[PDB]
Amino acid sequence: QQPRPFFMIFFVELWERFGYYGVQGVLAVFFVKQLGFSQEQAFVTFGAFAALVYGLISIGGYVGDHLLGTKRTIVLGALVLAIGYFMTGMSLLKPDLIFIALGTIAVGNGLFKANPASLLSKCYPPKDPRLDGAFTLFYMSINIGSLIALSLAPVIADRFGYSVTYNLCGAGLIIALLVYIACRGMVKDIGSEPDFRPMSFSKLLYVLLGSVVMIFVCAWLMHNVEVANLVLIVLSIVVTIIFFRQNKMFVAFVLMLEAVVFYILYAQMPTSLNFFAINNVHHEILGFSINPVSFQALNPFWVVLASPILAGILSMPMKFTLGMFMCSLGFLTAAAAGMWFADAQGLTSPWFIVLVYLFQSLGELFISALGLAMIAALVMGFILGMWFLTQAAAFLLGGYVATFTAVPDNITDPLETLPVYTNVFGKIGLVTLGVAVVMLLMVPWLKRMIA
Amino acid sequence: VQLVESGGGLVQAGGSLRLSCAASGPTLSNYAVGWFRQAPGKEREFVAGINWSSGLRYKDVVKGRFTVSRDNVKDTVYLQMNSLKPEDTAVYYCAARFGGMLPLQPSGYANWGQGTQVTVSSHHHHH
Ligand SMILES: CCCCCCCCCCCCO[C@@H]1O[C@H](CO)[C@@H](O[C@H]2O[C@H](CO)[C@@H](O)[C@H](O)[C@H]2O)[C@H](O)[C@H]1O
Ligand SMILES: CCCCCCCCCCCC
Ligand SMILES: CCCCCCCCCC
Ligand SMILES: CCCCCCCC
Ligand SMILES: CCCCCC
């Protein structure tokens, strides 16, 4: 059905995403059990990590488009990512490595993430109809990799330890690199412009120098989230001043404020929703025992099923508003299940968490799939910078919000933790509902401005 | 996923026993281990437990007498029972749940030992 390089790109993406979510699904639990962080410390550190992983995505597009070529940068990003996964597995021998290793993952992901997408865009004549089909199967690839990692990684860490989990993450990356290097001929005429002139070693050295610098700055900021807070605050207020100085752009600003709320909510799945499933949900579904941390797999799962269907079936403004209403309903379902549908011992049915993750995943399909692809319909380089800046801020604020559900290591009664989760999830849902009602009100004016 | 309990037996009122629970496969380190007991003709009740980060929970009638502790090198959890009384006679089970919580009913726990009999006699030496 699809060109041959499509399958190569599909599987490089699948494997890289397996490594990434292999780390993401265990990281907060690893901060708590392995490094003996408290839950509040684990949550804010995860917030900083996520923020950097997302903020540095801007780099890899520029580096692939203009410095080294798309395919060279796929290779380089795979290599730096694998180094980072093995460094994280080495952190267990050498604990002081942890932040450097996470910085290596962030920078690695930054160089890599934008680039398979680019390459797949260049596998099709410019107005080939199969482009949308192919991009939905690419998102399904991302989400199959994420499904498998979020399901199996916690099981592996429990049965074999973390060094083995992180080394498998590296091995996934190494076989992504091997399948790329094997299928390299399939993409010999595909690439950006630097891909086809000889490689400039001056530029490669600037990229390696700057990568190393950023690894160290990442490690510093995740160790010291209070200066990360101020760096991002001042960066935000300054870039807001310079956006206001220089109204399709104003509609883009309102849409980014909406995406910020979405990412604060998205940030909860590996933190507060994760620990809610650990503390106040039954670890058994359909008669099978599961690792509760595996519950995160419910987000890619629902994506994998809902993306074909929803591709079968207002425009951008309503789709953003719809997605916000969905996210609101996910957190209101979580609060409801805690307030009224709980066992005398303080535990709830995992079907409520299946439904929470459905609502969340649908909000993701409506917003983050459908955002910068058509924020680019409203615009440039400065607003991509401001986008990635503000979404990294979103993830930092997400970690701070998650800390409202933090439980001290010495509480052991689920009836003590259940009111905390339900208060926070209920207020998150009420605020997101208000935000969505304002979005709905603004849909007509916004829809005029897009004309 | 399967836990092995060792250490039960017969003891006179005021004596002491020590049970221990170990797991085969998963590291009990990630687990809240609770100890339940069933006396003849009653239901399993929560006795005593430790979570994955050393928080402890105790049924009121064993406070001051039982101690749960955890050896994270040997990957074993212990229940030290002192000042034993006849009403402590029961089948004792260990149970493991992932995480930091120790719920009170057996349905909160997925992994169960097979059980150890603990009997406490009213026997006292002759005066
Ligand atoms: C909702 C998403 C579900 C995630 C899908 C689960 C992936 C399949 C697991 C690998 C094959 C089964 O392997 C094993 O099966 C038993 C029962 O099935 C499960 O359960 C057992 O292990 C896990 C972690 O080791 C413990 O938290 C659990 O309480 C224990 O009973 C685990 O899931 C898995 O360790
Ligand atoms: C395909 C050619 C790859 C070139 C590898 C050059 C590596 C330069 C090392 C510089 C170290 C700072
Ligand atoms: C590969 C680099 C490993 C660096 C380890 C630093 C940790 C020092 C512990 C004393
Ligand atoms: C296609 C080969 C790219 C080589 C880049 C590796 C940088 C050390
Ligand atoms: C833009 C939201 C910032 C909130 C800081 C308290």
Can you spell out the DSSP letters for A355-420? HHHHHHHHHHHHHTTTSTTTTTT---HHHHHHHHHHHHHHHHHHHHHHGGG---TT---HHHHHHH
Burial class (CB in 10 A: 0-12, 13-18, 19+), A415: middle
B126 belongs to a structural domain: no
Alpha-carbon distance of A77 to A15, in angstroms, equals 13
Cα A177 from chain centroid?
A: 22
Which ligand is closest to the CA of A295, given by its number? 1
Alpha-carbon distance of A136 to A431, in angstroms, equals 31
Residue A94 domain boundaries: 1-451
B18 belongs to a structural domain: yes
One-letter amino acid at B126 equals: H
To the nearest 10°, the Cα dihedral for A97, A101, A107, A113? -170
Tell me if B78 sits within 8 A of B71, measured CB to CB.
yes
Tell me if A326 sits within 8 A of A381, measured CB to CB.
no
Chain B residues in contact with A159 (beta carbon < 8 A): 25-27
Alpha-helix runs per DSSP H in A122-247: 131-160, 162-182, 201-223, 225-245
Burial class (CB in 10 A: 0-12, 13-18, 19+), A286: exposed
What distance, in Å, lies between the first and last C-alpha atoms of chain B?
49
One-letter amino acid at A66 equals: H
Tell me if A431 sits within 8 A of A250, measured CB to CB.
no
The resolution, in Å, is: 2.7
What distance, in Å, lies between the first and last C-alpha atoms of chain A?
36
- What A430-434 contacts at long range (C-beta under 8 Å, 24+ apart), as own/partner pairs, is A430/A332, A432/A261, A432/A265, A432/A324, A432/A327, A432/A328, A432/A331, A433/A325, A433/A328, A433/A332
Tell me if A326 sits within 8 A of A154, measured CB to CB.
no
B63 belongs to a structural domain: yes
Q: Does the distance separating the beta carbons of A343 and B105 come in below 8 Å?
A: yes
To the nearest 10°, the Cα dihedral for A379, A381, A382, A384? 80
Check CB contact of B54 with chain A, cutoff 8 Å.
yes
Q: How many domains does chain B have?
A: 1
B3-6, strands of its sheet edge to edge: B3-6, B17-23, B76-81, B66-71
Do the bridges between strand B9-12 and strand B116-121 make them parallel or antiparallel, or are there none, so unpaired?
A: parallel
Q: Report the SS3 class of residue B124.
A: coil
Furthest C-alpha separation in chain A: 69
The percent helix, strand, coil of chain B (3-state, each to 5) is 10, 50, 45
One-letter amino acid at B26 equals: P
Alpha-carbon distance of A151 to A292, in angstroms, equals 10
Check CB contact of A202 with chain B, cutoff 8 Å.
no
Tell me if A387 sits within 8 A of A255, measured CB to CB.
no
Candidates B98, B105, B111: best to mutate against A (most CBs of A within 10 A) is B98
Alpha-carbon distance of A153 to A403, in angstroms, equals 24
To the nearest 10°, the Cα dihedral for A36, A40, A43, A45? -70
Q: How many domains does chain A have?
A: 1
Q: Does the distance separating the beta carbons of A412 and B56 come in below 8 Å?
A: yes
Residue B7: CA count within 13 A, CB half-sphere: 19
Calculate ∠ Cα A316-A321-A324, nearest 5°: 125
The residue in chain B having the minimum alpha-carbon distance to the alpha carbon of residue A346 is B103
Residue B21 domain boundaries: 2-121
Element (H, E) at B70: strand B66-71
Which ligand is closest to the CA of A397, given by its number? 5
What's the CATH code of the domain at B44?
A: 2.60.40.10
Element (H, E) at B120: strand B116-121
Residue ranges lining ligand 1, Cβ < 6 Å: A 151-152, 155, 158-159, 283, 288-291, 294-295, 297-298; B 1, 26, 98, 110-111
To the nearest 10°, the Cα dihedral for A318, A324, A325, A326? 110
Tell me if A272 sits within 8 A of A402, measured CB to CB.
yes
Alpha-carbon distance of A126 to A135, in angstroms, equals 14
One-letter amino acid at A124 equals: Y
Calculate ∠ Cα A63-A69-A73, nearest 5°: 65
